[PDB]
């Protein structure tokens, strides 16, 4: 309450925007073994795997997502998963929606008469969550194959907070639109 | 009266050097099954004995090139010995040159496995049918569904300022009730909220049926496990490895065996890698202990039972005896001591003396005891160990509820 | 030459062609096969012979003469007995036994553990009594905690309505009311989560109870047979087995002998066929103690109703016999071994017990099968139902008479 | 040019008397695989042939006391025959006295079983997991519960004339909703009605879990059925019977067989009762058809395949061939016709001629056809045949509802 | 005397003790064992010999000479070839073959059908598409019938609320409203009964889908291999197998030859090892056509990844060979039969293929096992969920803009 | 309605009383084979089995319910089932309750002032049903043992109607007590 509810919204969007962009471009998502090392430890990511021990240490190389196999351009479902996983459009989309939503909120402190601007931002913050939780199901389902052991890093959890924060600021932005409308009716 | 030589061997537990043998002397320097047997034999026959260990430290074998008998058999043939109370397996080559009494212990080849552990199910094992990712994605999807329902039910002023009861808190309540197949006091009236509710209901149905079905599969599969109970089971299967002692006559029994089963086991034995065989029986014991149930040693029944009653009792004799043999007392050819020895062995056998001594030196000195060893409930009914975590969750939730009730009271009062 | 023998399956049993074929081929069995390889090693001629008198051998307490098959050998009526004769002190003093060609022991015989008649309150079997008992306390615990929360920190949820809410949550039924506070909702959720696991656990394990049949014997040894008292056990009225328990000084077998004589009705029988039938008729309440070989043979014969359970209580063996001062003594002593290392005796053991076996020699012959649930399976919950309805009417009249006053 | 004798035999389909042979004459009186083979052989070699049936009507055998060859072998040795195109199994005794060409058809012993039926699940098969008595007692208990609830909710004037909504009709509705785990708009408020509701709920829970679990057991067990695929499966199991033709050499192969499997089968064969054996192969065929899958005949591959393509096609060849043999063309010792015959048989074999004729006389004349015989969906997913009865019940209930709606309208209007 | 031979496992393979042991014991295999019994029957002396040139035998189209192992026998370099030589017309004209000691045929080789990667919308697998399709029509049918009943014969239950009631009944969730008429209640009960069967049927069959693994090959013959086009198949570039399809006039094998030459990329290979790897790497999209013996041997060797499927397309055999005019011709012709009836050749067949088999020779070596469900198993219903939420917000704005106008 | 509601009640009780007594004392319940015949066809009952074909035809002999077995006086549950099944007290109780209820109803046409008499009869008619449905679960559970084929007769269904009628007249008697009370209040 007290009218600082907007400040929490725009603060959350900016942090939730950073915690997603930083998560994408940091490649400390997974911790596993893949035989590229010489398998050996890795701290992989959305784009590039990177060995951690052995002679190859501190050297990071792009992940293929298309090793030579008959399934390439053959399995409709498997290929489509690999297209979206390679592009990572869904996590990338999530950061875009938070950016637009934060702009709309900041563009609602000015043009303070309008209320439907805030409704857009609240929807974008909500739609960011759906893209985010889609962007992790794809990543998890893609990593699986066919008793190896893996672990999840801290860039993974950075994407997790961006879901929680985005869903919170969707609630507050709606509550703002509710409160604003009642004052106007 | 002329004292008679005995020529034991220090194999465990037939003869053991005492805990502190330096101060002791004579036959009291030793103890074991064979020592008490020799005492009983001397009592029955009516002579006096002086024990001895073979310098060579072995039982008996024919030197092929030298044409010489080694060990106790050699000490019997060549006049260095009058008796042999130790475990001498009855064979054709030995019986040709020396006279065996009737057996005082019948035995054979047997299977030695790592004992199955208690297998504590563990707290939070009811989550096993579904992966960690599924549960956490369920949580995050529940949050998303609740928020979307709250939005599409509390965004339109045309039904807001008039209305819908679906706030954020009641939306979370509705989603939580839906996931557990429990109805709530409210239900959506709009098209959007109804689409959300229906698809969440579908999700719930699929997920719960998956949990129940996979759990049923878990329990069914864990029920149909058939433990090894014979050698033919090992012959048919190949997942569990098994081997013998290469130095001894066990491999002599397997290389020559003509039955289909043991021939199959012999074919597997040498083909496998890196080495199913093991240099020493202690090494096989500790290997089976370390193999985590993936290696099954093959051993005489007596040592298997003996090991089964020595700490660490992580081993078990399984199945019956593949063959039948008998340890026996030996004497040189033409000795006057043959008849009384054989008759005394039998007389002890009809009495409980040999069984008494076996129970004494295998079970009464059992470091880990018996307690009717191997017994179990043999019930597949689910136990409180399986589902303890959910009771703990219930208790924690009740405590949190009481705490939050106190906080609510404090907030409302002041 | 004269191979004295007795007829007992599979050691010696008259061949179907008893009349048209005569002499050696007249008889057949485990011993009949064996004497061929003994004579093949030695070379001596032999003719199949049956002991005229059915006794095995013993000395009368007064006459002091040897009856039966051994009496043939003592008095020179024959020269060898390839037959199932136990090695014993009294028999060794007068004749010279071979080495054991088949090791032996007293064993236990039971009926095969069948699928029991399903009992009432069998529907509780998927969950142990600990879970059922701890479900109730949680049901009490949750209903109480909902009452205290709703009264101390209200927004009806009394005690009587809280017990209804928790019960309706356990059965997945629709609660008439729902908590409206946070503290009441936290209690409902964990109770709701608790049920979902428990109902699925019941349904899941029951599917295992019906999909897979796993029958475990009541006993696996003799310790388990002496401690208990529901199951009975007996031996032949005249035999070494009764004697072995009589003279035994071990605590467990002395404990048995107290039971055996103090039998009401008598545990003992006159012949092994009586003990077989008593096991085949007592429906798992009788356990016949006999030798390990009849039990193994019977286990592989029709109707295939019994099994040998546990280890062997005693160690003994059968041995070929020759008279005192026979040139045959050392060959047979050297021949049974030569068969034993070679594995011949194992092959004959498989031939006459397991191979030519009517029961399939393994559980793989049998296959899993299902049955539609019958009223006997779930009659306990009809009784619980009809019992509850009589209670409900009974309680209502009490309310009626009370309300009238 | 001298015509050469052939000496076939009337076994089916190698030689068949035509549909109406009385008007026909010469070699055109007959047809079959062997006839076309002889035509091709005559074309390649360059002679002219005159067919013949053995008067004896048999293939070949050595008379022990008479020391005489019977059948076709006799007609070859004793100059009555120059060729033998019929199926003559290559043996040691035959090859000693006559010369065989290379085989034109390889075969062996095979297993013949009753073909599994379509196994139509049947309407109202979803009721199978619970007996008829359980369902009917559920109905009667539902009636009793509804009546008791109505009583204990509508007996007391102190809450009646004021009240409870639990009439008989709403009580039946409440019980029906409770049994299906669906809530209703009402719930008891008294202690009596609440006891009734709770115990009925417990009944419902137990019954539904029982139905689901037993159905899962049904489908799982029906999924793990392993059909027979080899002889070792028959050796291990004993539930299904199996036998041979005692007259023929099949039992000659089994009595003498030294492999562990076939020795086991031979031990089972004579021990069983009343008679696994059968006098004639047609009798074995119709016995397996009548046995309802409980008898498995053992037969040459060729006749098994032949029977598999003759109405009634309720039979199937299963597994591979236990042994390997070959039919062949025979000629007398030292004949000039041996070489061309053997070379022509091979030349046809590299060409598709023999395969063509086999496909012609086994499959193209298939009364029941092939259509890639034995293929199946091989899917365990539940099908509409299993759960058709509940759809029919739904349709009947909807029709009854519309009818009752019409009746309600008529009653209310007038 | 001179036993010409070639080295190919298990027929002849160099023994590990190649150096220290020389001569007959230098080599080992199926043929090596066989020549012992052939010479035991005949009595003649023999020495193990390898053909210097790796070819089996054929006549050059220009030179017209016999290469390889047969060329040894034509030109008198040896007197017998106990080796895997196919009986054929061109080889029979010049030398005299024995009778077949092992029957043969072209076969099919595939990768073992593995547990496939679980697809999205795999949660629908327990119920066929017919049931899912007919559930929807019933859901439409019931909701419609509830509307007509409630409007024509009222006591709200419109069309929009009736679709909600039926959906909430299918998911065992609490209906906000219940019918109050008899005709509306009859519709609800049968719908309620309908669901209870369907939900249990889904849950029951899924427990079978997870409890039991049942993998069926895509093909069981060659008809199924020619009709389809997803799976490929090839032969060696130079061998009889390519020739057999070339000269074949049967419709099915002529159909194959169209595919084989019209290969993009080439189906053919230079050696059998290439075809083995291509099957072991194509993940079930390649089917190698070869002889029935290598396939049986390979099926019993590590990594135990392939199987022989279907019957045999052609019938042929291997035969012992001797030169034209050899006194050995009739004994070997009379010896292989003597082995064949006695069953020796079967025992060697088991010895070198099945016994001494790395794969256990049966599925009993393998055992059932379970795996916790992963997100890939049930990702289809998360996508359906998140797809529905985006639809719900989309529909709401349409209502918003419409309501604004 | 119209006051003949009592006539239906007393008519139902008298018929429901006959259909139960006749059912008990008629022994055409089951149709199966039991080896007493020479197994052969039977038309059994609560008390006496009776062969139907063979030399033994038209001769009916009492059912034992206690063949010599160790379970006699040993299994607490099995023995108790066999005590009640042999006595058939529950079906016999059901006919008694219908008789008393019909007497109370007939004793309510006279003493027409009272209403609590009818409540007793309505309860007895209801309690007759519970004893009846108990009396059939016992009978069915007792017949089972351990693929034989059986069938149920027409005396079985006679007991079934007595359940249906008894539960109906429990409804009407209560409705009478409801209607009577409202007229008095
Ligand atoms: O971009 C990203 N979005 C995300 C959403 C959730 C999570 C997550 C967390 Cl926060 C804890 C535990 C498991 C998790 O993964 C899950 F999908 F839930 F299984 C990680 C994420 N990363
Ligand atoms: C009431 C509206 C229509 C909905 C009900 C659809 C009824 C479908 C019933 C089809 C049962 C199928 C029976 C044939 C079995 C088969 O398809 O092979």
Numbering used by the authors:
A (entry chain I), F (entry chain J): 16 to 53, 79 to 186, 196 to 234
B (entry chain C), D (entry chain A): 388 to 549, 564 to 815
C (entry chain D), E (entry chain B): 395 to 549, 570 to 819
Text of the article:
AMPA glutamate receptors (AMPARs) mediate excitatory neurotransmission throughout the brain. AMPARs associated with TARP γ8 are enriched in the hippocampus, and are targets of emerging anti-epileptic drugs. Here, we present high-resolution cryo-EM structures of GluA1/2 TARP-γ8 AMPAR complex, associated with three diverse TARP-γ8 drugs, differing in size and potency - LY-3130481, JNJ-55511118, JNJ-61432059 (herein referred to as ‘LY-481’, ‘JNJ-118’, ‘JNJ-059’), occupying the same binding pocket. Modulator selectivity for TARP-γ8 is determined by two residues unique to γ8, Val176 and Gly209, in the M3 and M4 helices.
To understand and compare the binding modalities of these compounds, we obtained cryo-EM structures of each NAM with resting-state GluA1/2 receptors, containing two γ8 subunits at the preferred B’D’ sites (by tethering γ8 to GluA2). All three NAMs anchor between these two γ8 residues through a common oxindole isostere secured by a H-bond between γ8 Asn172 and an amine of the oxindole, consistent with our recent docking study, and replicating a previously reported binding mode of JNJ-11840. While oxindole groups are shared, and their binding modes analogous, the remainder of each compound is variable. These variable moieties project towards the top of the GluA1 M1 helix, increasing the distance between M1 and the TARP-γ8 M4 helix, and triggering side chain reorientations of Tyr519, Met523 and Phe527. In the JNJ-118 structure, the top of the binding site is capped by Tyr519, which points towards γ8 Tyr206, comparable to ligand-free structures. In the JNJ-118 structure, L1 arches above Tyr519, effectively capping the binding pocket. Mutation of Met523 (M523A) essentially blunted NAM action of both JNJ-118 and JNJ-059 but not of LY-481. At this position, all NAMs break the GluA1 Met523 interaction with γ8 Phe205, and force the Met523 side chain into lipid; the lipid interactions induced may contribute to negative modulation, and are lost by mutation to the shorter alanine side chain (M523A). JNJ-059 also failed to reduce the GluA2_γ8 equilibrium current, but still abolished resensitization. This behaviour was not seen with JNJ-118, which acted as a NAM on GluA2 for all measures, consistent with a recent study.
